[PDB]
Scaffold this active site. Structure first.
Site, PDB file in Angstrom:
ATOM      1  N   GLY A   1      45.187  58.847  50.846  1.00  0.00           N
ATOM      2  CA  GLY A   1      44.834  58.689  52.273  1.00  0.00           C
ATOM      3  C   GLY A   1      43.343  58.471  52.466  1.00  0.00           C
ATOM      4  O   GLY A   1      42.838  58.913  53.513  1.00  0.00           O
TER       5      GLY A   1
ATOM      6  N   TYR B   1      54.572  52.306  65.458  1.00  0.00           N
ATOM      7  CA  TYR B   1      53.324  51.710  64.930  1.00  0.00           C
ATOM      8  C   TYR B   1      52.711  50.813  66.006  1.00  0.00           C
ATOM      9  O   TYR B   1      53.453  50.172  66.767  1.00  0.00           O
ATOM     10  CB  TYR B   1      53.563  50.953  63.620  1.00  0.00           C
ATOM     11  CG  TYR B   1      53.911  51.839  62.457  1.00  0.00           C
ATOM     12  CD1 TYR B   1      53.656  53.214  62.504  1.00  0.00           C
ATOM     13  CD2 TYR B   1      54.501  51.322  61.308  1.00  0.00           C
ATOM     14  CE1 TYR B   1      53.973  54.035  61.443  1.00  0.00           C
ATOM     15  CE2 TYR B   1      54.835  52.140  60.240  1.00  0.00           C
ATOM     16  CZ  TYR B   1      54.612  53.509  60.325  1.00  0.00           C
ATOM     17  OH  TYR B   1      54.960  54.354  59.297  1.00  0.00           O
TER      18      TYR B   1
END
Lengths: 299, 299, 299
Positions: free
Chosen positions: C215, C54
């Site tokens: 999403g 990330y």
């Protein structure tokens, strides 16, 4: 007719009579229901296939009208019934949407209604009618086990389950599931290669084949010409050959025939007259899939 | 050449020579068959891959012509053969349709013909050539177990089986299946992600890779440019890099190379000279699939 | 907030806060990171979801800036992190291509960096981030087992594994994998019928649901109208209903919510206020799939 043992506790006729259209007949009288059951018994077809939902939750009661007016007739047959599908019809008309229900409470309510409607204290086989994406397998498996222990249900199976659905529910049960009622015919051959039938064959579970004639589409060219040819070689009709193609498989497939026509019941056993050798089995399979089997990969 | 133990009873060369084209050569003389086997042995390739059906049921006899005229040559090689596919050619020309036969009677007849045709009393490895949608696993597994107990077959495996086919046949056998011969290459990468290879890897079963060069399509842009670049970095040709891409996988894949060309046999071992690090393995895999591997789902 | 035991050794909050966007915030100061963690804790969300990759291998260090400047804050949370994806960013910028690495050496290096970056001696849960087509399950399973024995990792799971990937890695490990972090929402319903969720349900493994709101695509007609209606019936927003649809499933799905917005964190727990009966669950499922559930096969 030759018998098939699904387990040490349940034996069916090798061909099963599907009663899903019994409520569609213009005649739903006890007398006409008895006539249909007696036509089956004349051919050694003793197994009747029902579901709570058939006739919008009325087909079992229509069968019951027959059985309740003919003492002794229920002792001559096995009854398969199913639950798990809730459509807004009949006693479920309060329902807001079409859904599945595999809860202990719903299964028990559906079984109690099947026994009430058909006038019997037991069903031979109960199937979960469709795999429920919301299933709690622990809860459902406990309800199914208690139904067997109670004597209300002699054996339990499933319908339209994938191998992973079958595996999940069996992991939660003490009793062994004795069948999976799935689509199998010359027009529906995916289970033969996709793992559905292999899984059942490894577990020594006989499938019940629904729409074994291809759901009316087979009779409406090359496949039909070969079925008619083999039938004419063996003194039977093309329908008997299409059922014998299922009967030939070593997984011990149990076809479910769903006609209201007394003349198709009269001839239903003709499938057992068919000699279906390995090459004939492949000829039909190849005509149905529309292409040759895969040969040597090195070519 | 480095050896691979499929089991405690069977060891192959890490690369296998596929003889499916041996009957297509203009020269099928014993002398030319011996020359091909001797070219393999010169590179440490001792394992020959055959099938009853190759050459329309003549390729084994053509190999046999070589072996029968060169005493001692059979002791230097392992022989893999296969049965289960029945096409109307050669001794099966009476056949009405192309079909599979996994019956005990057919397997025994095919094995007896393989031993007669190659002039040997045993085969190192026997494969069921294709998954049979009509398989009786109990019958087939009993025939395969007896073939091992007899010493006629040192080990048994399958070819083109899906995991569910493998699982069904293994459930019916005492002996462990030692391989599955399946398509694997830079042009055939589905088994790497679809469960086919994972199943074999969990069972500690090495696959044999058929069409490991992609079946002639790879040589006929980005993938070929990278294979040529890596080959030129390591002093080998693009062919050796495409085989080394298989050899790199921790499932211990055994490629089967099927050339009649003595110069491609001469260089076949060059794949073992390739150092294929993890990043290079991914570079080739990504060029072949035509898209990047899936990265973080959160993006 | 209600707790969920993934195992005897690991308990999460029933909703998890995904920190994948923490590096995208214009504010990455320790003070703003602490504020986000404190907003979660105010709603009983104690579980933070991270990954080495990330922020291009910087998001953990940004979380660490928060934790290192607030003594006692790490003891209040569980940390999930992940490794296995190697992209050419940050400390992996030498990388020639995007690849997976499940080697013992890489897992250990990634875990050591996660502990260094977040300023802690242990992570609550470590996930293999993606199934690696080049996995050596024996090697990876040994590394994961040693990480648990060491106390550096309290429990291990996977992410985006298919059932066959899960099965292969679990076959090579002594410790039980406690989760699979997979896409699940009203826009991603395949796992409910394709065997992915059934496998986890049979193994009594809770999945973690990534992109549980679909999403960003769900909010950008019929599905949204029903989510808004149910929310307005129960005093919550459509977002809470979309999460409650996951919370309703008997597989005990753990949603991962990935917002940088303190006002969506403030309301995240509203999903637990939703009463989602079986019919409502089906109404939403049916609107999302865009077609009725399959009814009786006999029709």
């Amino acid at each position: 007719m030759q018998r098939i043992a699904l387990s040490d506790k349940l034996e069916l006729s090798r061909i099963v009579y599907g009663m899903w259209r019994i409520g569609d007949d213009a005649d739903t009288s006890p007398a006409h229901v008895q006539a249909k059951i007696e036509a089956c018994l004349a051919q050694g077809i003793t197994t009747m296939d029902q579901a709570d939902i058939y006739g919008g939750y009325t087909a079992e009661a229509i069968l019951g009208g027959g059985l309740k007016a003919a003492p002794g007739l229920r002792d001559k047959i096995e009854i398969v019934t199913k639950c798990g599908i809730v459509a807004p019809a009949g006693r479920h008309s309060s329902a807001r949407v079409k859904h599945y229900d595999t809860t202990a409470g719903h299964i028990n309510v559906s079984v109690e209604a099947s026994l009430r409607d058909m006038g019997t204290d037991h069903v031979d086989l109960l199937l979960i009618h469709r795999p429920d994406p919301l299933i709690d397998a622990e809860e459902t498996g406990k309800a199914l086990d208690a139904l067997v222990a109670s004597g209300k249900v002699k054996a339990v199976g499933v319908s339209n389950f994938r191998p992973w659905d079958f595996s999940l529910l069996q992991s939660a049960m003490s009793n062994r599931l004795v069948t999976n009622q799935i689509e199998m015919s010359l027009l529906a051959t995916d289970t033969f290669t996709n793992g559905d039938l292999a899984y059942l064959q490894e577990k020594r579970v006989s499938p019940m084949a629904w729409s074994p004639l291809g759901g009316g589409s087979l009779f409406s060219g090359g496949t039909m010409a070969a079925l008619q040819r083999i039938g004419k070689e063996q003194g039977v009709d093309a329908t008997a050959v299409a059922i014998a193609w299922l009967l030939r498989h070593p997984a011990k497939i149990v076809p479910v025939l769903g006609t209201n026509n007394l003349e198709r019941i009269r001839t239903a056993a003709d499938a057992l007259r068919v000699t279906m050798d390995r090459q004939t089995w492949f000829e039909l399979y190849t005509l149905a899939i529309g292409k040759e089997v895969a040969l040597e990969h090195h070519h």
